[PDB]
Design a protein around this nucleic acid. Structure first.
Lengths: 47, 110, 37, 103, 142, 56, 150, 117
RNA sequence: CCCGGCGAGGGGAGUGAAAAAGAACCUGAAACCGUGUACGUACAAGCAGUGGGAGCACGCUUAGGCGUGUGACUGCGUACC
RNA sequence: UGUAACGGGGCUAAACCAUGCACCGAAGCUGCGGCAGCGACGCUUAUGCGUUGUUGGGUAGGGGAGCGUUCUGUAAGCCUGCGAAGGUGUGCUGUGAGGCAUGCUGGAGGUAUCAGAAGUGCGAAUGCUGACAUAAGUAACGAUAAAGCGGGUGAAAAGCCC
């Protein structure tokens, strides 16, 4: 029965994949808005 | 009975050959040879050799009787280009596409 | 031919000449810029 | 002799023995329905409605085929704003056949 | 079922003769445009020429109100540059009055291939007689 | 000096509508030799208007 | 990627797009963007979750009649023929034999049989109790299992 | 686990290009233009599932207006008449009777003039 | 064996299960280029579609008046990022 | 630049003012059919319905739910030379990403279900690589020292040899 075991309900959440398409919700800008220092790779200010 | 001859890899671009092929398409064969004898193109020499080869394949490999044959199909496909280099001014080069073609003459009596 | 074509596309990649566009193309861009000032 | 009757949402002008494609009725496949709300009967003498639906008229129609119509694509693209949404739709229908028209 | 569409092979269309003496230009023109579309027929179909052939006659005797006899100006440009060429209403009635009724009706008809085909059915004459006795045009009193 | 939209293959064939070669249109038959030749030209055997010329 | 850090063309004036390295990940022959490294895929399983899981699977092997308890299970000589005949007599093809004292002859007799696996009671894993159709425990192995799983 | 993406990309492109048969030139050959053509056809198709209801209604009104003026009353007065005569025939059917059955349409005009007076 | 310049290329023959497996050789996509057939197109203006839609050509079909291709004419309609 | 300050024709009312009754008019509201979210509510209790109310334009962005790809386990199982993957058509199907069946090509592999991991989905980056178009059978064929004829060889001679 190793093909009948199954995880709990709610334990494995999907994982945001950014940059794929328009339907996914997080495409083009991946959830990081328009230009600026925060929309840049490595970008962000210090603590 | 349809009888084919082809010249694959003919050094002449397919445009230049298609002018001549468009001349003899549909004609009876002796009339087509009389057209290609008096057409002053390089392509008419090539097309004439393919047509003469198709009459010979018809009369030898198939049933005879040249006088009933007609050029039913003729078409010129494009072959592979030979990519060469023309030296232009100021140090720049071009690719010359030395173009080939594939002449097909399907001759038939019906 | 392919080797000569890759190198002879690689001819004006590290150029300097400023009156010639892209190293080689002649123009009037000196007078255009100079007249814009 | 034709007859106009009201049906699901809309109206139909129908002779006898003619197959009509209506909206989805909640009827079994071989079962017979009656439309008691006929608006016109014309044979060579017209009969229509001062007050609506004709007093003595009814259309007996046998249901032929429930079904689901041609797919249509619904496309919602907002140019230049990063929004598109496609969707599809097959409308349920009911083919009936007019058994008879009683004036 | 589907809404009926007139079929241009099977459209029957009649011939009408209209006397344009003392009619107002726009009001006649609008009635002719209605009859040439085929808007007066129950088999009207917007992509089919269903209208009738109208023979307008006495086109030089058409009337306009106010000072439009002298102030209404017909401009056209010739394509060459300073080619703006005007002609008042009475100059047009003198030169070619057919152009008066035909300009009016043409501007009332839908622009496009169909409305050109609709204008080919209008036949205007400046006189009282027409060549079209073979087609038997019945007198459309409008 | 250079195009601004790539022309179609439609417009390309339309331009080549006139590039067609005309046939010969009929070539004439010699009087004596009975063989075929362009008109007003000599034959392959070297006759013209039924008399022998060149003869190479 | 085995290349050079020479910039392939000048920054401005060629009409080419700007490029800086021939080892860019956008370039053919260029170097994976987020290239992988050798990594460890081990998960921590808490000890009480491992033992809990074994208790659940043993309870379901008992409940689904996939658990056979024999008193003794040993083969005469180290021959796969003898173990094949022995498992044939007991109506078992796919089987996990588990014995509290690992016999040498049994181990050599099951080494060629594909479906059959002999374990000591110490080294059982979840994936084999679930994998094999029947589990055949020696009684000594049952006692050792209860000592392991408390 | 490297995933090559040839086969599924080919399937998407092909899906779009099958939805663009019959378009002129690149619109039916090149993916990058057939994608835009297919979408713009989608937007038009939506928009025109609404306009066909508007266009058919204006066609029917023009036919009832023609046939009713043939029977000596305008469209406006005819619809007012039939609403006051409490006739609920919609105008698809009035257009269709007005083409196919001239006598029934004449009788409808008589109900309209009868109630309208 | 035949055409061909004791060519190139081809057509047969033969091997092969298969030579549109022939060395330019497994599969053989797309762009791009052709040949053939059906329809449209030489008085008509524009993101080239879409809604309507006649006619024609092929298949049906117990004529059931459908399907496929084309698409005159007509409403609306200024690509994507 | 051309009427060119009603959209146009054209209008002496088809203008303006006052009153009134019609009709047209949107993706508004209603009718009919369908789907989905959030409440409430009697059961069904691990949820579906006789219900029932109401909501469903959407950028940045947040939340939820899925499809496909490659790889691992299930799988020494199950499909497969009576023909796999792939390629190319057709038909059916789901709200969608998609799925399923099958003709032809192909000629040897594919993989359910339920889990697991990702080099997991491209139309754009003057993106990288290959192929192929376009202008186009167009400019050009590289000193304006210059060729003409006879003969030979050859399948063919302006260019080779004499």
């Amino acid at each position: 029965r190793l093909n009948t075991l199954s995880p709990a309900e709610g334990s494995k959440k999907a994982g945001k994949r950014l940059g794929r398409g328009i339907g996914s919700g997080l495409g083009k800008t991946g959830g990081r808005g328009h230009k600026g220092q925060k929309s840049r790779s490595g970008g962000g200010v210090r603590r | 009975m349809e009888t084919i001859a082809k010249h694959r890899h003919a050094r002449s671009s397919a445009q230049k050959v298609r002018l001549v092929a468009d001349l003899i398409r549909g004609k009876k064969v002796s009339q087509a040879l009389d057209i290609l004898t008096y057409t002053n193109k390089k392509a008419a020499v090539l097309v004439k050799k393919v047509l003469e080869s198709a009459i010979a394949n018809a009369e030898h490999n198939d049933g005879a009787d040249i006088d009933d044959l007609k050029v039913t199909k003729i078409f010129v496909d494009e072959g592979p280009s030979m990519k060469r280099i023309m030296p232009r001014a100021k140090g720049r080069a071009d690719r010359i596409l030395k173009r080939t073609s594939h002449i097909t003459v399907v001759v038939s009596d019906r | 031919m392919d080797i000569n074509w890759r190198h002879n596309q690689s001819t004006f990649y590290h150029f300097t000449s400023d009156h010639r566009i892209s190293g080689w193309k002649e123009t009037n861009a000196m007078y255009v810029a100079l007249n814009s000032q | 002799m034709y007859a106009v009757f009201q049906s699901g949402g809309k109206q139909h002008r129908v002779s006898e023995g003619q197959t009509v494609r209506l909206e989805k009725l909640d009827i079994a496949t071989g079962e017979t329905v009656e439309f008691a709300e006929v608006l016109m009967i014309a044979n060579g003498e017209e009969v229509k409605i001062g007050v609506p639906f004709v007093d003595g008229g009814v259309i007996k129609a046998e249901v032929v085929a429930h079904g689901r119509g041609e797919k249509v694509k619904i496309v919602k693209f907002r140019r230049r704003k990063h929004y598109r949404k496609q969707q599809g739709h097959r409308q349920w229908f009911t083919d009936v056949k007019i058994t008879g028209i009683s004036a | 079922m589907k809404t009926f569409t007139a079929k241009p092979e099977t459209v029957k269309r009649d011939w009408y003769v209209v006397d344009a003496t003392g009619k107002t230009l726009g009001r006649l023109a609008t009635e002719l445009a209605r009859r040439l579309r085929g808007k007066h027929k129950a088999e009207y179909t917007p992509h089919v020429d269903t209208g009738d052939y109208i023979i307008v006659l006495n086109a030089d005797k058409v009337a306009v109100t106010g000072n439009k006899r002298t102030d209404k100006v017909y401009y056209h440009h010739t394509g060459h540059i300073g080619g703006i060429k005007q002609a008042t209403f009475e100059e047009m009635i003198a030169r070619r009055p057919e152009r008066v009724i035909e300009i009016a009706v043409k501007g009332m008809l839908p622009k496009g291939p169909l409305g050109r085909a609709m204008f080919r059915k209008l036949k205007v004459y400046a006189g009282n007689e027409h060549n079209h006795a073979a087609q038997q045009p019945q007198v459309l009193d409008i | 000096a250079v195009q601004q939209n790539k022309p179609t293959r439609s417009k390309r064939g339309m331009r080549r509508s006139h590039d067609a070669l005309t046939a010969v249109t009929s070539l004439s038959v010699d009087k004596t030799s009975g063989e075929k030749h362009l008109r007003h030209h000599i034959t392959a055997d070297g006759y013209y208007r039924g008399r022998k010329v060149i003869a190479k | 990627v085995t290349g050079s850090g020479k910039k392939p063309w000048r920054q401005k004036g060629t009409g080419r797009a700007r490029s800086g390295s021939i080892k860019s990940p956008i370039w053919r022959s260029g170097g994976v963007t987020f290239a992988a490294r050798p990594q460890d895929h081990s998960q921590k399983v808490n000890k009480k979750m491992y033992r809990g899981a074994l208790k659940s699977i043993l309870s379901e092997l008992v409940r689904q009649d996939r658990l056979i308890v024999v008193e003794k299970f040993s083969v005469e000589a180290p021959k796969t023929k003898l173990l094949a005949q022995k498992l044939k007599d007991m109506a078992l093809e796919d089987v996990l034999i588990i014995t509290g004292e690992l016999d040498e002859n049994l181990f050599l007799a099951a080494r060629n049989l594909h479906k059959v696996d002999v374990r000591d009671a110490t080294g059982i894993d979840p994936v084999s109790l679930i994998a094999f159709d029947k589990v055949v425990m020696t009684a000594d192995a049952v006692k050792q299992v209860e000592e392991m799983l408390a | 686990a490297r995933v090559k993406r040839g086969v599924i990309a080919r399937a998407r492109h092909k899906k779009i290009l099958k939805q663009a048969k019959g378009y002129y030139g690149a619109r039916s050959r090149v993916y990058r233009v057939a994608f835009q053509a297919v979408i713009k056809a989608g937007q038009y198709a939506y928009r025109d599932r609404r306009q066909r209801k508007r266009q058919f209604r204006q066609l029917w009104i023009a036919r009832i207006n023609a046939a009713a003026r043939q029977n000596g009353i305008s469209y406006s007065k005819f619809i007012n008449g039939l609403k006051k005569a409490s006739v609920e025939i919609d105008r698809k059917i009035l257009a269709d009777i007005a083409v196919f059955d001239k006598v029934a349409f004449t009788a409808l005009v008589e109900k309209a003039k009868a109630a309208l007076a």
